[PDB]
């Protein structure tokens, strides 16, 4: 099979503390290079590259594209944000929590949870443990949920309460979900 | 704190343009082209919200003008093929008969274009298949899930095949209960 | 619902 | 501008015609409006750009095509005197809305 | 949806500043205003979906925010009157949408 031509369009609305500051960010990608952009922070088009500059000379003279762009901030940008506002930005979904070995090694499995941001700590006899812990990282499963895996390195003795702690948006109060060996 | 992206391509020769809204890299919704629908990411999205696809449309043939044009601008140049990474997931910790499900994550990759077939000891399985369409990243490449629901068994092994103009050869990646 | 909305493309000038 | 012929036609009952309407500013949305004596604007037909048509208030009884980025031409099948009007026709894309000189339209008995 | 236009109807002296207001839901944006003429001519006197714009003795201010614009004409001159038009976008369809408008008679 033979050759490519992709022409990529992006209107990236930014957030800040909510809807108080706001950035609009147009791009255009030919051939997964930018090369022109209005961002609204300028005002007006640049090129990226020289690619763009005869468009960026041009939609510069345009002046109802420069004005719409210019309010696309308040039209578009905070318009949107308030239609799916309650749905995405207040989307809750309370993470799972299981922990079990896997000994010397202890898992916090954290699943299903939404929005990402998130704190995983350990716990030995409700001691924090900072030492040795181990992160796969948060992953983006595709849809609307998140997961994580939190590792400690311990050898376990007999007795030993080993506890997991997941803040989360979704909870006022952390989740505490214990082990015991 | 928070993103939107309207995200949009065209794609010169295969004739394919996808229209998409994305928020902090989940899709809200994209329009099918074929059937000039809205079609929601998650069904409860069209209770809160609606989207009237119109403007949509004309933007991808505008998109396409546009391909049409730069192609030209550039003297004809073609897009450098990127290979993805290929990512083998499951939903939660695998519990032996428990439901779980696949998650195929396709990464890094250019020309929005790859063939995707979830396998299953070695039968193509397509019954309770699903897929995202083609989500933005950062760099200007792309990232796209498939999914596969199944009772996790001693016995399978699943691999996520996966084709593309960047690999010299269709990419098999490999899963089966730990 | 309410009415998500869009910002149109721009041509970029005919040859 | 936009441009739109007839500004003035006298129609029989039953009879066909065509209004065009141009716009040489590139703009790809362009509409059809009707316009009762001391009324308001209400819409007939619209269109976003090249192939895609759309009714809008009171497309009942006109029909419209965009081939062509530049022309909106309307169509009227069968005159009905209820279809005497003063009709308009507009283009914007990313801001002003443009408008014809007008179409002043009378149905006969 | 739709787009409220306020005084349906004003009689003013010459000379006079005079207030028009156009209130539009959340289904629109994008504002503009027109002027029809006793004659069923019509032509843009702004595209102002944010801010204040100014053109002689016309002004006009949006707050996209707050969902209102409003077309300020001062010294009103006799030749002012006619329709005045207020319309938006419908978001996502871009169906330009007219409200009823405002009858200005200016009197001599």
């Known amino acids: 099979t033979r050759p490519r031509f992709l022409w990529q369009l992006k209107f990236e609305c930014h957030f800040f503390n909510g809807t108080e500051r706001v950035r609009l960010l147009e791009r255009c990608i030919y051939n997964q290079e930018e090369s022109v952009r209005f961002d609204s922070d300028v005002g007006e088009y640049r090129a990226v590259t020289e690619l763009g500059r005869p468009d960026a000379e041009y939609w510069n003279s345009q002046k109802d594209l420069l004005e719409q762009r210019r309010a696309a901030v308040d039209t578009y940008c905070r318009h949107n944000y308030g239609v799916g506002e309650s749905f995405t930005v207040q989307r809750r979904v309370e993470p799972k929590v299981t922990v079990y070995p896997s000994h010397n090694l202890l898992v916090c499995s954290v699943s299903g949870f939404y929005p990402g941001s998130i704190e995983v700590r350990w716990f030995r006899n409700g001691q924090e443990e900072k030492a040795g812990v181990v992160s796969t990282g948060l992953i983006q499963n595709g849809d609307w949920t998140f997961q994580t895996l939190v590792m400690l390195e311990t050898v376990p003795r007999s007795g030993e309460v080993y506890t997991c702690q997941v803040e989360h948006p979704s909870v006022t109060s952390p989740l505490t979900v214990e082990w015991r060996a | 704190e928070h993103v939107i992206i309207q995200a949009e391509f065209y794609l010169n020769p295969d004739q394919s343009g996808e229209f998409m809204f994305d928020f902090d890299g989940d899709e809200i919704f994209h329009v099918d082209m074929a059937k000039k629908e809205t079609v929601w990411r998650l069904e409860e999205f069209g209770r809160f919200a609606s989207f009237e696809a119109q403007g949509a449309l004309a933007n991808i043939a505008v998109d396409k003008a546009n391909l049409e044009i730069m192609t030209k601008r550039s003297n004809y140049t073609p897009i450098t093929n990127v290979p993805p990474e290929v990512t083998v997931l499951t939903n939660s910790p695998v519990e032996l008969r428990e439901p779980n499900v696949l998650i195929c994550f396709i990464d890094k990759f250019t020309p929005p274009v790859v063939n995707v077939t979830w396998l299953r000891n070695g039968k193509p399985v397509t019954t309770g298949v699903s897929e995202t369409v083609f989500l933005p990243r950062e760099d200007h490449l792309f990232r796209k899930f498939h999914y596969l629901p199944f009772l996790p068994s001693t016995e399978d092994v699943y691999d996520c095949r996966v084709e593309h103009w960047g690999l010299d050869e269709p990419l098999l990646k490999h899963w089966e209960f730990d | 619902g309410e009415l998500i909305g869009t910002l149109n493309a721009a041509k970029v000038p005919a040859d | 501008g936009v441009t739109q012929t007839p500004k003035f036609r006298i129609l029989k009952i039953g009879q066909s015609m065509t209004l065009q309407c141009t716009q040489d500013m590139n703009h790809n949305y362009m509409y059809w409006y009707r316009q009762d004596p001391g009324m308001g604007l209400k819409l007939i037909y619209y269109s976003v750009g090249a192939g895609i048509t759309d009714k809008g208030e009171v497309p009942n009884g006109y029909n419209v095509s965009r081939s062509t980025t530049e022309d909106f031409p309307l169509r009227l099948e069968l005159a009905a005197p209820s279809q005497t009007s003063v009709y308009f026709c507009a283009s914007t894309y990313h801001g002003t809305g443009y408008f014809g000189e007008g179409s002043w339209l009378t149905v006969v008995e | 949806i739709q787009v409220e236009q306020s005084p349906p109807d004003l009689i003013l002296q010459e000379g006079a500043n005079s207030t028009l207001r156009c209130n539009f839901s959340?289904?629109?944006?994008?504002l503009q205003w027109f002027h029809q003429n006793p004659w069923g001519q019509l032509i843009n006197l702004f595209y102002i979906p944010s801010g204040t714009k100014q053109n002689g003795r016309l002004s006009a201010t949006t707050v996209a925010t707050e969902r209102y614009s409003l077309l300020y004409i001062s010294s009103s001159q006799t030749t002012d009157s006619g329709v005045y038009f207020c319309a938006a976008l419908i978001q996502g369809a871009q169906k330009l949408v007219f409200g009823q408008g405002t009858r200005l008679t200016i009197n001599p």
């Open positions: 959340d289904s629109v944006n994008n």
